[model samples]
Target chain A: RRVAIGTDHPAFAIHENLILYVKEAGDEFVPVYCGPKTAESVDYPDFASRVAEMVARKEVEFGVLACGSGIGMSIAANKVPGVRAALCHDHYTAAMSRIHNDANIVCVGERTTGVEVIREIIITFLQTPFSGEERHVRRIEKIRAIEASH
Target chain B: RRVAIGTDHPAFAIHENLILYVKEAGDEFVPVYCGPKTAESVDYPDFASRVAEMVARKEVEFGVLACGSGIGMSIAANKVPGVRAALCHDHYTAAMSRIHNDANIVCVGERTTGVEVIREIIITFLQTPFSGEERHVRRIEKIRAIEASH
Candidate 1:
């Protein structure tokens, strides 16, 4: 899978480390860049949008975004159509978002979540698939219909 | 532009009324269904999901969902990836959602808003276009990236 990753100043170091960690994990995925290279006073939403646009356009298979709290990034990301971005503090929400909601974006807070836990969260997000049950499919269809109208 | 619409028992009458209202407005958009035909007790999430899925899939150009508070449907619809569902009480939010967030779904509270207001809100929602300015596009892209990572 192709994964686009981004972050702002507050989480810059963690975001950089995550890239190396993902590469070391030996996953056959391309990591796309969408953000500030150095720690500066950049806006979280700016980086969030950079990653989101690629994902929304299907330029990448998935995205990972980071910030101080993760809340702002998630809220901003969810504003875009066709993007289901979930702010997860642990593995449970990360897995559930994909299994139940088919979330394609994962947002983590460097301030609140540990680096190792973030790794686990990302792994879980990648592994889980949409339940695709009758009920789930029915629900997803409704979402698509809503998108078409806009 | 096709509009997918749905509602639970709490707002079934409002949903019914809105269907006529859309037709009467003489808009060129088609109104699709994702709903409960009768006003009986049912889960708002289920109906909201129905409308949201269709919109997300691009089967409909937009979605109009309603519940007792409008909150439930908006929350439910937004859970789906690719669906920007907004619960609007007045015209400002409806217009702003499109102009700023590019929302694809409009959620309303049948009990909270009058029929006339609801009608106006829907019309405003359909009429407004995303600003698509550099800043807005930047923000929207971030949202899409967030969706991709989850």
Candidate 2:
């Protein structure tokens, strides 16, 4: 799958490993740079917007993002009209995104998540699928209407 | 990606269409037959359990379960350990499932959702990303711990 990956300064150090892991998993990745090479501070929304716009437009099939704690990046990403980026700390969540809510983006924290965990989470995140049940579909639609009305 | 899917009688017909659509999207779908094929009905819990169990065990990377309203299926699936099934009725809820709860499964209703609407919901559901803010992560972890206790 085609994916857009990014991280803020705090997580930039581990980005190479993530890029490597993405390649090893047999997927095409586009690394969106969000900050400087050094550990200087960077705005999370700057990176979040770039990737959110891509996924919202379906320019990328999926997204992977990281930050010092991952929380900021997630919040920033979701601010975009259509981005639904979930932060999965474990394997169960990684897979559920695809199965249940059909999440296209997976966010992780470099400081909070070890490389190994990120590896596994990535594997599960990309490999899973959405269930597409009827009631589930209806529920999702209702939410969509809510957003449109708001 | 290869995925397993299931639905109760209340959602079988519509869920089937959803599965077909998912396949059309180039996703490999495994339809777990759990509901009635005709007028006869089966237990909703049984169908939900099967779907939730498969997903929880990694036998399926994702799941879609349905009942009459979708709420019951959602509740049942959420009962499964580590299952964050969202009883969504619109796109906003579906998006929130990923952003707020880090939900794994999204339950919908066939009887109520129109064919094209379901398709759109599926698109919106899959397209959105979670917002991993501190509040969102904290809330999800709280849910995770609670689910783990069950």
Candidate 3:
């Protein structure tokens, strides 16, 4: 599946590595990255929105948004329709977010996380699929209703 | 949007009112409730699983799991894949959890939350949307990864 990548200024170093890592992963598709390649300072939401839009429109199966804390990107990304972005700081949660929540986007923090763990997080995010259980449906509905009201 | 609602025996009486209020307020979809339905004792995780499963799938947009302290339910609910359940007893935390963390499930304590306060807390959870900002995403991702490994 195609992947979209986005990152904020504070995480450019890590983001650069992540970009390369995604390419090296040998997934079926190349990643579409959105952000300042020059390491210029930019707002986190700008990149997150663009990436989220791509995933929301199905231009990509998933997205990766990065920043200092990961919280900012996730908050902005989730605003996009049809995109459920999860902030994953560790391996197990990343897998669970994908397997159980079907999160379409994974957000990460450069400063707060060990650079070495990013790969495991991304891999886990990609490998896990949605659980799609009957009981789970009821809860997801409540979440959608909130969006529907908006 | 439908909701998966669950609670342990510790808060069944309160959970009943919460569900009733949800319905009376014209929450169109009926919540899938799991618990002792009666006064017999049972494990919180066993019932919490029913709620988590529904939320994990897109079957329910949100889940509400309650117990005496809300802590046990929160711990148990998050054990399920894809369920970001936050124990939010106050209105601010409830709203913020949704706005910042995009928590799919809100946990409340029957012992601590009065009916009016519970209503307020529920309103907060329902009204707020995830911010999707970089900082928020970063933080959430950290939590996600932590949960994944543990």
Candidate 4:
């Protein structure tokens, strides 16, 4: 599984840390660096677009988006259809997103959340699987309907 | 200004608390309950649609979405055009979402975070405003372009 990693200046310094977490997610997981390598100021949504578009296109198995607070990245990533991006601060949210929402992208806060918690978020998010319950399926389909109606 | 609140069964118990958070956000702020009245099993996306659509239509100044982890609500709400939903865990993420993304919806985890933190997140989000700087405005327009291009 190929994972797309994207981040802005606030998270640029920790980009390498995210890659390591992906590797720890599993040996089968491979990381694709799609964000900048420098710490120069940049818009988070731009990077989120790059990573989320790939996940939406099925070019990647998953996506990891990070920003100042991870809020902007989540907003931008979910803008793309077929991308269920989860902004998580801990393992519970990370695991719940995968179990309930079948989230494909995990967004973590670089500025607000600690590196250890972000690590837990990404690792747990990747390891957890969707529950696939009937009610959850129905809800997800309704989400699709909302997008189509738009 | 009116604030619409939506929540799933997992957060049904805290619906009233969210209304209080909104009132404390400002003296002029009014809270609207758009979620379920009971803890019966309900799809989160339905409520997210109800509240987010109100915000998108400008009928409400903002939206507050809560769930087990808040991941699903944010994903579903952001699917609605003209709604920038941010899943926040702390004051920084809460304030940053409003300041940077001009977020109209604040999503919080009822189960993952404590009540006090959720209170801080909602109040900060409602009180904070957009930066309106040239660069931030440019990025926001780019986000709009992403939606338009979609």
DockQ (Cα-based) for each candidate: 0.01, 0.01, 0.01, 0.03
Off by over 4 Å in 1: A1-150
Q: Rate the local accuracy (lDDT) of all candidates.
A: 0.81, 0.71, 0.78, 0.91
lDDT of 2 by residue, B1-150 (tens): 434455776566665676765565444444444445675577777778887887788776566666556778888888888677877766677677777776667677654443454555555555556777898888778877886677
lDDT for residue A132 in candidate 4, whole number 0-100: 95
| Residue range A77-141, candidate 1, lDDT tens digits | 87778788989877799889998889878998775555666787888887778888788778877
Q: What is the C-alpha lDDT profile of model 3 across A1-150, one tens digit per residue?
A: 788888887777666677766776665647777776868888898899899999878888989888876899999998977888999877889988876678889998775554556777887787677898876666667777888899
The runs of at least 3 residues in candidate 3 whose Cα sits more than 4 Å from the true structure, single-residue gaps closed, are A24-26, B1-150
> How are the candidates ranked when ordered by TM-score, highest leading?
4, 1, 3, 2
True contacts kept of 1: 0.00
Best by DockQ: 4
Candidate 4, superposed: residue stretches over 4 Å from native: A1-150
True contacts kept of each: 0.00, 0.00, 0.00, 0.00
TM-score of each: 0.49, 0.47, 0.49, 0.52
Which portions of model 2 miss their true places by more than 4 Å? A27-38, B1-150
Residue-level lDDT of model 2, residues A47-92, one tens digit each, is 8778788988988878888886688888888777667788887688
**What are the clashing pairs of model 4?**
none
- Residues A1-150, model 4: lDDT tens digits: 999999999689789999999999999999999988788888888999999999989999899998877899999999999899999978899999999999999998776665667878999999999999998899989888888988
Residue A67 deviation, candidate 1, in Å?
50
Candidate 2 vs 3: which has more TM-score: 3
Docking class of 3: incorrect
